[PDB]
Design a protein around this ligand. Structure first.
Ligand SMILES: [N+]
Length: 230
């Protein structure tokens, strides 16, 4: 069978890439083999020799930092998605339509991803900041090691609500489940998610097919189906 593509995938984009890989494999005959986790954790793994050949980041600074450190194919970095951040519980109406629960709520645990490694976690800390609520919300925070773990804390009842990726609650034009407030962008840095071809993916055929496929129509339609822009 054809060249495989080792892809490091930021946790928010787990479900999206699983769906992309099926059509990608159907369409190119290259196999996408993915690992899922926090962006900063892949920065570490990639610096240490991880076999990954493509890196789908939840930010743009980290693929850019890797390029200025000699780990990236120049000309390879592009934006493949722009995410959105939402406050969310599976309990309906608990997270009101204007996010007033943050200001008046009585919750004890507020799930965010580790903002030192997970950009959807950093967007959460930015928004609390610009919302004027950092000092009051700080003690209630509970950090997952990536945005999938933060979401599971909420989904499992280990916290009353959390800042989750829109990708995890959104399908086909709508939040699908529980209670959400869409964080308005003026509160955090836009979640520009960049891809990059790493040194081990230079002159690999699965890798070029993959970045070209992520810019194609089957890919673009699925990415928009999960609430991402462009
Ligand atoms: N959990």
């Amino acid at each position: 069978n054809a060249d495989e593509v080792q892809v490091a995938v930021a946790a928010n984009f787990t479900a999206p890439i699983q769906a992309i890989a099926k059509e990608f494999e159907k369409d190119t005959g290259h196999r996408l083999v993915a690992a899922y986790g926090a962006t900063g954790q892949f920065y570490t793994q990639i610096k240490n020799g991880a076999p990954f050949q493509v890196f789908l980041s939840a930010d743009d600074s980290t693929p850019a930092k890797l390029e200025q450190e000699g780990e990236v194919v120049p000309g390879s970095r592009f934006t493949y998605a722009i995410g959105t951040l939402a406050l969310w519980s599976p309990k309906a109406g608990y997270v009101d339509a204007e996010g007033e629960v943050l200001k008046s709520g009585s919750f004890r645990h507020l799930s965010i991803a580790n903002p030192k490694t997970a950009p959807y976690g950093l967007a959460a800390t930015q928004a609390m900041d610009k919302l004027g609520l950092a000092a009051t919300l700080g003690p209630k925070l509970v950090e997952g090691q990536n945005i999938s773990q933060a979401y599971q804390f909420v989904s499992s009842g280990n916290a009353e609500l959390g800042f989750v990726a829109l990708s995890q609650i959104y399908k086909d034009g709508k939040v699908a489940t529980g209670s959400a407030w869409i964080v308005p962008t003026e509160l955090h840095d836009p979640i520009r998610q960049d891809a990059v071809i790493l040194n081990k993916g230079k002159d690999n055929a699965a890798a070029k097919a993959l970045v070209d496929y992520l810019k194609g129509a089957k890919a673009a339609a699925l990415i928009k189906s999960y609430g991402y822009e462009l």
